[model samples]
Target: GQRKRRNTIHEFKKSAKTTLIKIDPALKIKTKKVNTADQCANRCTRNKGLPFTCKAFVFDKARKQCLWFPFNSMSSGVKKEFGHEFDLYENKDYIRN
Candidate 1:
């Protein structure tokens, strides 16, 4: 008498040279120094028990600055603003159906 559980892995979106994804600096949960944007995304995915999960992140590719944002940090709309130094990754599970 055993039950099975299903686990799904969702792929997040990566927007390069765009800082339009809205994330309030106030709701920023944490910041880390990472080498690549993929590395930053890995760190965000590992935490399953966070109060507010890592819904989005802004990574400064040049400086390797990783900024994590919670679900509450974002507003209603998402638009792409032109930027050179950074990119945005959004959690697929949160934004997708």
Candidate 2:
């Protein structure tokens, strides 16, 4: 499959509707409101300074809430839970795929 995009906005793959299970409050670095999932991508990318690495993000389409996380659903201690309200996106450089 030619799904490997070269120069497109990174980490913006076919946005799987998978979010973290048992989302610990401590795990969420930041939360914001945005219009779309890709807005979280910008939030993740813009936050490249101190606090955290901004490795991944989640967008609640139903509520338009955004959450920033140090790790994605792929990381240890975190697992994907399918749902209708949220979706997970990881930095392309960090995903196992």
Structural similarity to truth (TM-score) of each candidate: 0.63, 0.66
Clashes in candidate 2: how many? 0
Expressed as tens digits, the lDDT of each residue in 1-97 for candidate 1 is 3312211122556767755444445443567888877776667777783444777666788878876656422444334454588877767675422
lDDT of each: 0.59, 0.63
Give, for candidate 1, the lowest lDDT window spanning 10 residues: 1-10
- Name the lDDT of candidate 1: 0.59
lDDT of 2 at 2: 55
Top model number, lDDT: 2
Cα lDDT of model 2 by residue, 1-97, tens digit? 3524332336543355666643555454577888777667756677554155667667888878877666766666556665587767766664532
**lDDT for model 2:** 0.63
